[PDB]
Design a protein around this ligand. Sequence first.
Ligand SMILES: [Zn+2]
Ligand SMILES: [Zn+2]
Lengths: 81, 1181, 65
Amino acid sequence: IFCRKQAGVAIGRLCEKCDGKCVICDSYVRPCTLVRICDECNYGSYQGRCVICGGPGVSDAYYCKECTIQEKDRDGCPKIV
Amino acid sequence: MFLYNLTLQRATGISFAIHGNFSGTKQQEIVVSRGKILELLRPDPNTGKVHTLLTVEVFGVIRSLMAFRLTGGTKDYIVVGSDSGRIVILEYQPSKNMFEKIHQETFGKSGCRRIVPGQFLAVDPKGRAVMISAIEKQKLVYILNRDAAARLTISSPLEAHKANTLVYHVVGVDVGFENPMFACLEMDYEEADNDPTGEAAANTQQTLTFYELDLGLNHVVRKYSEPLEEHGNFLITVPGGSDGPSGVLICSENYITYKNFGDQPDIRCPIPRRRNDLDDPERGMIFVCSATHKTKSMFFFLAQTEQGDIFKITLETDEDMVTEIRLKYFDTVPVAAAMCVLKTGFLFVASEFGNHYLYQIAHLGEEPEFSSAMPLEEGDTFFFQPRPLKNLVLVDELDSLSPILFCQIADLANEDTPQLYVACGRGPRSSLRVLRHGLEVSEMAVSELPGNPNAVWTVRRHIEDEFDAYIIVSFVNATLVLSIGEEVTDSGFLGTTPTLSCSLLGDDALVQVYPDGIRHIRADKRVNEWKTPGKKTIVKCAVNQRQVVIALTGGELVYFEMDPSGQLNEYTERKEMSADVVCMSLANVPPGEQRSRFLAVGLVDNTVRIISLDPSDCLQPLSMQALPAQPESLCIVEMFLYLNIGLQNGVLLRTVLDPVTGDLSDTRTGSRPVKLFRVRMQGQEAVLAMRSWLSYSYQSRFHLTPLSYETLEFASGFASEQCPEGIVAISTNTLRILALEKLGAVFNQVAFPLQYTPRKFVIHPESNNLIIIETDHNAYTEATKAQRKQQMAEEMVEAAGEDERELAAEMAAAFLNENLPESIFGAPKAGNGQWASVIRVMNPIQGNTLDLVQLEQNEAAFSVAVCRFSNTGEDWYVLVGVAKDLILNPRSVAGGFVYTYKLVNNGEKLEFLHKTPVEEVPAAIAPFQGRVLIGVGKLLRVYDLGKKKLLRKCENKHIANYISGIQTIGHRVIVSDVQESFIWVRYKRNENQLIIFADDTYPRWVTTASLLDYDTVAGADKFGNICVVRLPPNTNDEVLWDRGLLNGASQKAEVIMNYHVGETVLSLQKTTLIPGGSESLVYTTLSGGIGILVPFTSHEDHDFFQHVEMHLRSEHPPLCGRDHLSFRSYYFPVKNVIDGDLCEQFNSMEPNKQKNVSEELDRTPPEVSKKLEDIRTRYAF
Amino acid sequence: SKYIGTGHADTTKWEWLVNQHRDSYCSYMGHFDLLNYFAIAENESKARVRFNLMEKMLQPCGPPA
Ligand SMILES: [Zn+2]
Ligand SMILES: [Zn+2]
């Protein structure tokens, strides 16, 4: 289940285990569009946590080229909750 | 198979225009949207003239624009709403001459979608927030602020969504430094979707709703909403804080209303109507656009009505409260997409269609001033008299081709270079415009020279002069010295002998060169002379503001340089060349230098050679180049140094200049030895080669455009009181002073006025006359307009009973004689279903009307043809297809007619022959095998001529919907359906049958069609796409149990090309635009854009531009945030087209990006630019 | 389901067409050229064409069945 609220200026992050992965489709191939998340997902204790699984977040999350081509980057906040 | 797209002429129409200091400097500029293109304009307040600073293809649909400024800032940002799902903020950068994308906030899916924001865009007047909203449901609010580094920063969006709710318009409300507020005209459709009686739909009130953004609580509250008495079409922000009483002005049918929140009463004023208006009395009146003008003391609005009339609107206040609106009629101008008031006292008027205008505001408004405070009776109205311009003075008109409705590329003028015949405009501002590639030339003076003139030169008397002081003229046996007005012998001590050159020798000095020697002339009465040593003579020469070089018999070169006192000194060294010198050139000196480095020398050797004149390496060779043939001429120039070469043959050359000369390019330029001359243009140095041609730079690119003018034989630059920047030229005896009207424009246009919107025209083959059909809906014929005016005058008298009848008769007589021009005041709007239409025969060379047939009221011409019929052999007939009493929405028609005229007196007169009735609109007429095909609604018919009527000889009933067009080759007929695209029909002679044999597999809303080959059709549609459909090989055209395939024909055409042009295309034509050039598919757009699609000749070329396009798509992404591939794939996936408008963005990029992209291509940037130019120069300038 | 415009097994003729018509008029309001086309064809001001389209948004197909 994706949050799907209005994406903000906050940037999505990935933990070490979930890195390279597109948030929407788990592909390791061609990261393309930088992930944006809703404020509530960035708020307080949630600052810098992983979009896929809530881990410490070390890298910037991306939608892959296919998700970008399909405009799946536009659906809203993709933090899995 | 594989096509490249290029724009020739960019869209000239304007959809949006905004005001600001986009440069940050105090000068005011206009950013305009041309739909597909963003453009920045500077009106010069001195000349009162508009210059394009910058144009950018944005590869998306600009749906809205705003300027905004942060509080305490000095520069305006452009915020763009678009079909991209992202709000984009741009800053213009004057230094780089580009828009720089400051922010790109994404919120939704691309396309012009109903519930995704982009249509409406509103800013807090103090810059602190922007709202972007859709037509339905979604509104988003972005907070704007600056960081510690003074860069603009943007928040996460705050939503303000409302289900089932339409938005007509949104504006920001000026509330000073209180919480930002946006006003929306909203309507809730929920009840209207739930009531089967329709009661709710009619009882639904539009509401004015005020959304407050709470900056402290970071949310948007729908603070106030109130219903409106009638629906507003748009809102105007009224100035607030200390500049006004804030609130908003709702423009509605027949009214303008002022509303504000709090204890403010509603103030309402009716829109004044024109006295004795010939329009349909049932029509209500809206304001169509507005502008706001603010000043320290006061403000006012200009609002334009549908009729073009501008009202100055002002608000009267007591304390904070508005007490009345006051309207004063201001002036009448063409109907505007946007109006903008410049602080410098000019009104820019972006016309809805046709040319745009800059007016100086001469006065700010005896004319009666109307008011909400005036008592007015139920159903009554204020009245005003329209008249000629009184507050506005026209200073500039921006020639625009929007809308292009029908174009035809042909050489009708015998100029060996076809002209584009375009039917433009709408209503009484319609025209036929002839477009010719080249610059527009104006004669500033004309004269004739005796005997055999052979050369001409121009000179100052001092370097400080604002103008030249001498023209020197040459003949085969003599020379002559003239003033810049007349022979002048004041300081002109010129020889009578034949001359090589005359020039400015130094700051106060002149020189003449002749085969014997050199004469030095001062401004003061003193003459010095030099002669050629030995038996030798001078043959060629080169000069600069402080230097002379000469070439003698046998190829000996001699050099002279000016010492500080002001005298030439001969250099000690003399050098001989390997061959005879044919020409020479020397670079102009930089203003902070005493001497110029580079001499170029051209030889019988078919080589050009570079030499230094600097004392460090004087007369030493630097570099040399071999050439295709002997030079005729040379010229070194800066914009950056270039050598230009003319050959005795018609092939020009450009090379970059340095101690080693770099890359080069060449072009046909013609047959006569190519002669090169210096010229001054827009203050810059440029060169004239001789068709004649200017070589110059604009938008960081280079252009070699001909002059649309006579054959010229020798020339020079000019500056004078009569002609401040121009040319002295000679053609045979002719001695002309010539000036160039425009820099950037690729076509010059002559405009021939028309009465109604031209639907189509055809060229009579034996005379080149154009038969034009013009047609408007909502329109009176002249006959009906006369009758309506007569009865209005009669009724005006009959309204009076007392001695007032004497005054009424005077007023009626005046009214019958008043004749306000339709092109200025608008044609009177007849009701729905009313048509006016004419058939016009005009000569294309100068647009005189040879004949004019006016059709009956409510007859609308929709098709025209010119043809012979085999039964009569030689005579030409014009067939015009007419609808009777056509109602557009909902569609209904009282049948139609085909009028037949014979065209007589060598193509000059329409003799009416007969009128043939038909059951539905004859929407297409096509000459076919000595008869004519006619598309009568869904029916395709063959008609023969007969005597009393056209005679139906064959018919097909199986076309899906209305036939929109017909084309033919041989026995094949291509039918455009209005929606079901292309159907291939074969006529069979012996059987006398029309058989459908193929169709498309997609709906296309076809607008126009061009046959490429016997099996291939190019189509345009209503949705801005081009396609090419081809019959697959071994398609057979020789053709309740039959069902066909997918409910259509048994055989299917295959789409071999798809491309979203971005603009609706109403014409396509396979043609060669330049003599000896390759053939292309020319297309015109509704926005006045002209472009080409051109086939690649080979894999290598195709592959190269494909790789260029792929790299530019990622490394130089479209400005307003739309994916380029997605945009070109708007309605169908892009197929077999490379966007050359994207490829040519390469030249606009920063050099590091050019280096990155060219490295990816295994090229260097000059090679990339060369390949871009080489394609765009083979098919069409 | 949440996206306005989506259908499902119980979508009627009327509902679907009202979607097509409201979606068409929004497309017309955005595509400046398609708006140009209609304004010229009707011999009408762009502002009035937009206003007429907005008016039509309320009940584009006549009342529900
Ligand atoms: Zn994780
Ligand atoms: Zn993905």
